Amino acid sequence: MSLWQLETNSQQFLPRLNGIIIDCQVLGPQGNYYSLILQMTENNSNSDYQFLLLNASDLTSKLSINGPLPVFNSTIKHIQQPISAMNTKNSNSITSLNHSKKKQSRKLIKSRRQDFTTNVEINPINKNLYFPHISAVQIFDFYKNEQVNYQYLTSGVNNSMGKVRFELNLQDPIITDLKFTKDGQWMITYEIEYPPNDLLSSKDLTHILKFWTKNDNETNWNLKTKVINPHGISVPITKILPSPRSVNNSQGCLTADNNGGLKFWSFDSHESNWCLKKISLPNFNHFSNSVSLAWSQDGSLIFHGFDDKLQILDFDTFKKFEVSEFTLDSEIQTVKLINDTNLIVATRTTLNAINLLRGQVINSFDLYPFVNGVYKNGHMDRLITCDERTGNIALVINQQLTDVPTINYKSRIIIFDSDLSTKLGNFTHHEYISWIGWNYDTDFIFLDIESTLGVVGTSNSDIFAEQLHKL
Amino acid sequence: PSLSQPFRLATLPKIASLSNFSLQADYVQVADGTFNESTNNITLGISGSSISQYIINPTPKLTFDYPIPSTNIITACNAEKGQANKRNVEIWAFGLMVNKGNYTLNVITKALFLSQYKIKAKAKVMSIKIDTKNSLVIAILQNGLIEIFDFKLTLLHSFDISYDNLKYAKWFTENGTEYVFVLCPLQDDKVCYKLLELTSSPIKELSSTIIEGFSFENSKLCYQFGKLYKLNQGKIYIYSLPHCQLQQVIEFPMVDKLSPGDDLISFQPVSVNRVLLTVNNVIYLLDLLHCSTLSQRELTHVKTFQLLKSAVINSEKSHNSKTIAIGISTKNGPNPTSSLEIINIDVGTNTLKDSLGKSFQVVILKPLFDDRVKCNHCNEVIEKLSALQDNDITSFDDIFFKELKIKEEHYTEKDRYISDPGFLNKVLDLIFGKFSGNDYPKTLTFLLTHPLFPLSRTRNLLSLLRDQPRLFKQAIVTCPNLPLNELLEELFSIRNRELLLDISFRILQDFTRDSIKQEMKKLSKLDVQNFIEFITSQSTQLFQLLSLVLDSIGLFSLEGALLENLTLYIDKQVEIAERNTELWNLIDTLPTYTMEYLDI
Amino acid sequence: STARPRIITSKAPLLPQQTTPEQRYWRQYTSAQLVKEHNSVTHISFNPQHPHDFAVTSSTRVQIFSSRTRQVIKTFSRFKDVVYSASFRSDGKLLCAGDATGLVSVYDSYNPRTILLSINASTHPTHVTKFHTQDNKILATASDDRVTRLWDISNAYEPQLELTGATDYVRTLSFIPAAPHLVATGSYDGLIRLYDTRSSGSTPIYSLNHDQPVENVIAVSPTQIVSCGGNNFKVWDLTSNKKLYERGNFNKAVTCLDYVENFDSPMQSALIASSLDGHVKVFDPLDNFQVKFGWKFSGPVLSCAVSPSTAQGNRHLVAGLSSGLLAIRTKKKKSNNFQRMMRGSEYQGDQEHIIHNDKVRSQRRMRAFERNINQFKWSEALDNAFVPGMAKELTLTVLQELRKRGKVRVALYGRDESTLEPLLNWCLKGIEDVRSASIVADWVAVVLELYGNTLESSPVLQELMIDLKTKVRHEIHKSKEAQRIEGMLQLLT
Amino acid sequence: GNARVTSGDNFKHVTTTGTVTVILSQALQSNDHSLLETVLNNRDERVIRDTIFRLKPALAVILLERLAERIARQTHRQGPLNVWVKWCLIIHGGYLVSIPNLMSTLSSLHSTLKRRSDLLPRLLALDARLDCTINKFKTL
RNA sequence: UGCGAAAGCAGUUGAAGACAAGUGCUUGUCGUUCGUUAUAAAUGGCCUCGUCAAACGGUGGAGAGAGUCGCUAGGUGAUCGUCAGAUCUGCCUAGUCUCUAUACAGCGUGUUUAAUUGACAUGGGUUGAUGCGUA
């Protein structure tokens, strides 16, 4: 933000604002406060407005106001990027605006992939809500309904300078997956750093993994360890699963590839840094983004669901159990166990409850009519959530149309008891629900594309006193 | 978890009281102090014979014997080692009947007979405890009196639980304090539960509750780690101390088939959430938490086996997973002979790993919603297919595809309702029985593309389809979970290049090298020698398969003459790969005085 | 608004044997002096009191070295025959020494002229003379007579006690801390004998078998004693009377052993062990006695010692060599009107109601290249990278930083052969390193795509690329070869 | 700050006279880098094979770790030291096979070798680009 | 744009209206419409609050520098030359060998697992700017 002094044509600056300035104003009888509107153009999926009230005295933020800032997979409703000098990924030129609006409407109406599911996490110790914004994490307290922090978890040109013209084509590293260990003292983050264009190394994405720690009193996560290119070179970390309490008192995690390799990392006190404790070979030439990991509460066995096949692997040997092979009709999107006995597996065409104890399917529900190609691989995992005491939940979103599809949606939540024998409850909301997850209490929190976090869960003195207060 | 063969300790005497094999367990008492995880001694009280102490290892042997007259029944027995006024001594306490007229309480001290004492007790000594630290002997009486005695049997204190007809009493230590609880039958299947604390009065009552619906006559009771287990009519009821609240009920189907009266059952605990159950000559090791049968064994050389006691592991604190149980084994024959048998027990790790797939308890697509938004009979068919004549393809295909409304000859996402494994397995059986030789129905092509093709029919599937190339190709491309063994054998046996490349790609996609490499070792040296020779004569999956061969062959088996030829071929291939790689990068990538002619 | 982030230095994945915190501390014993003595320096001891001067026994004399001056300040040359010890008292006032004649003398430390007490312990040589740490008045002397007499300073005519039972030379004596009655002696028999002076004594309470001649016994802690003998050193626990650990990293036979505790190092405790192979290595007792650092000297090492815990000054490591060379390594540690004028600076608001603190901490100065990037001087930032005496890591960042900013071509527009050669010179070298190979790949690709025409007309640029082509070709062979090794290494598994 | 960087391939925690075997066996046992360095300084390939041939298989493993380090810190030593590594695998291949764990104890080799192998595709790409321009002005 | 892995496998980028410029015709444009899944370039770059010196604790290191005609393995030059070799007591690369404030980079020492202090009136005026140092 530039204050131009018109008397001498000089100027003063306030740089490194959180976002580009949509609007400015001088608010006061004497211009005591400046009111600014910021955009945070990094998130192209949605328009993220932040209202800032700065004290003109020392240019310090007197009041910063912004709601939850999720990053949906695709653009929503009528969101259009602002106007710039050139047509880029984060901006629209003069001509591109109308054509882009028309194309967005056509995409929303005609196309069949309508995935807007956003990743979110919940801090167990604090129950704060963590949003993986592009190259950053926004920590938001839903009890108080106010933001608590905004931290850059990545390298890259993020707030070093204001990108302009061709620089605006640059892509900052994207924080893909974010998860906490059970105890809540360790934060695991996964990054994909995109190379700049027009270079030899313009087609080798860099996969990064990081481990952070903080004391409860502190509010900033301090990076403790960094792994560059885990699992090899140019091989994404599709899934991350923090370890249960039984295995290394919740100081361990699993990472799983699209080559079906599993790497078990742990925190070693002697080294004082995380170490690669166990490995499985990702050598088979079968590539699929649809992998799901579940871990038994005791920690002995691990369920690795890759493409259409599920594996029961011993943790101690980190190999196949010695039926460990379970074939499925289609590729598995999600594997979880509602309780230690029952394992719920969701494939692209149905969902099935299995007894590990019997090795037989109890119930099978047909998902194909509602989920056929709407969602990309792995996102059903963030649409499906399970409590560890009462039961699980399924979330199904429908495009509602009257006389060709319309933009507005209708979502439906279903509570299910363990093994899916009965529907404990059935509810409907009037808007697209991006994510539903299980708060560590009995209640569940879900997020709506309108950025609305809903929850589903179970005498003369007396006259003299008044006058004195008036005076 | 595993069950060892029982090994004999001693042969029970031929006494009339012990002739009743059903009641034989009641007449043999096991000392609690001497039988635990770490003890190598067993003190046993046999009614009418003696109270004897046996060393288990290295060989079973008798160490001590206290004779008893044949007319007496040992009601309770306990032995403990400790220091008494200080000499290391072993204190033995036992209570006997002579025809119910009189009740004898006896305490014996031995130097490691220093003293022997005898008193007349008021009611049946149901169980006996020895406290060596305080030099006390505590006896519980069936009339409800708990009497504390010194080692000389001088009465120090007497506590009455106010209820008579006591049937069961058991001690347990928690946080260093000794606790005891009792079960007193009442009328109408009602039971008084009481919990007592041993510390002016040394006995304190902590809990007193009446339990309804608790029968004794057909119930077998044992305790472990704050949980009381009652077995009745094939259902194990789980009660939680200190209130003995019923937590869980576990149905055991294998006991439900037992005719009442002829089948003899014994039930003891062996570890946390694990119990030992006998059904005549059969022992089961059961995990109650996951409801699984960890291990089962049958003793063919005995008519029945009765558990008396088991050394229980606190495996949450113990790294030992091995313990022992003692029982009475009865032989088959006109003159059955009863003997004391000890069995070694491997409980396991108490994790779900052990219980997977061993449960002792014995599908149609359902819409998500029963009831303006954009949308993105197995038995009858089998019977219709079964009724057809042999070698009739057209009708067989027509019934299958039409009745199921299948539109394509290969599986699609629209055939999900057909996925039920039971229906698919039967149809495969019909195809084999109905059709043999050179002609198979088109349904087989559909089923081969089915992702849920049964594993039972995968074996030899390639061999059946060898005759027809098209079915063979279809199996390779889409048949799920085809064996690696059959694929690998066909790889080195088939001479067709297209099949070789197809098989190679399928093998690598669906199997790991450590899985493949072991099987490649099994193959004969000649076949692998031929395969290499074909090479020297998409290709990368064929090359990368070669590297797996060269690994499996090992260093020693490889012979120099061939190795040279493989070298020249590879050296050529390496040069070509470098040459092509360069081409790929290629595709991606004024003078002071000048003379000119003016145009005019 | 927020402060500008600092450019983050590039750190490649860790390589084997990073510098450990233990190695960093011991590496600070930098300054080395080599003194020559007449004969082999057999024993070296440190005064337990300030200034913690240390005494070296060489030939037939004792020399005390000043800690700060690292030079001789006192010399004891009265001794006629070879000397064998210079241990101080706990109070540090008294120095005792043994002689081949067997006479043991006690001198006032720092007063060579005066001789307090002279004892004829035995007719045989008296190799060990050590003061008792708990009790000052009692002296223990071990002799080739194989009896470790326990003398008293007040009564010098007869030993207070005479311990026996050693069937060979006793050259090692140690007093266990917190157990004044206990005394430990180790002989070349291979047995470490423990005695109870409170009892009648003269018969060991129990023996510990080493199986090799014991060259020195040190009581590391009240319950642990470490004994070094033969080609290894073993740590024993008395409560269990068995060896907890053993380390045989040495090649020659261990001779001397010393222990220091609760000193300002990252390692709370250290155990320095001479080897007789020229090696003295530090072992950390907290970590099962694993090696953490080592030195090498010209010849076999016969004595090693370190400054006590309370050095209160520059620490010292002293190594003794049979050739007589002594090695020292040291870790060095206006107008009154104008003051009445401005007297309020010292105050820190200790009495005031409200304290307000708003000064921003002073950040480290930014280098030239970082300033240019912050001011968007792309072309200059590249120049600051390629300057004499620029750290290679620091040079790699500005190259990566420009690439991250998307300013690679922009940095290379306004250039000719004159200002392009510094980049090519570095690329000629950086292409070798694994870490900078990929970044060199990108930049060299651009300059060729941007200065093809200038390349033809300039000869000097051509020779750079010819040499560059040779080096990249050299790398292809190395990178290929590493793949071949990985191929074979896979076969073994 | 002071965080530890790491890579996913660091599986650390999962006949003739003139032979210098005697010096080597002592040097490896005592971790004497200076004594070891003199042994490695010899370059006659015949001497190399004789040494590793007579060296005890147990000491062969620790030799590979030491050589793996010296290559990793000093790239210019990769060439001459590679000969040592190649002979160690060939001679002691039988023993190396029969080891309970190799990744933990040979992690330095895999880390060093993986880094160099990963560079191969890019270095080739530059070689093609350099060869292009080098050919162009040479013919012109 | 669709699908998929990250590699890639298929497929698009049309029509109308209006305005401006140049000469009814040509080109370029669109805060104009319909349909399909569908270069840039107005000389224009990010503030201030405190700097300097000396330590200490972790994290990295290609170490930062200087010698040794001491070795090992290479590459290579000037002149003469009977092609065998000569002088330059040739040069360079890499390793090894000796040494030093680890001498090199970075984060912190508002509380942290660990770890700090000191200096200065943070002002105004005058001279020198051909400054000062050096070849």
Side-chain angles (χ1 to χ4, degrees), chain B residues 380 391 416 438 455 478 489 530 544:
Chain B
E380 293 175 0
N391 291 337
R416 62 187 182 274
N438 274 352
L455 291 164
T478 77
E489 282 176 13
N530 298 117
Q544 175 161 359

Side-chain angles (χ1 to χ4, degrees), chain A residues 283 348 366 369 399 401 423, chain B residues 368 372 374 376 413 416:
Chain A
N283 193 333
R348 205 168 72 262
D366 184 10
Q399 193 154 30
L401 80 172
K423 303 175 163 147
Chain B
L368 260 70
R372 64 181 66 86
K374 181 266 289 181
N376 57 15
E413 290 202 342
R416 62 187 182 274

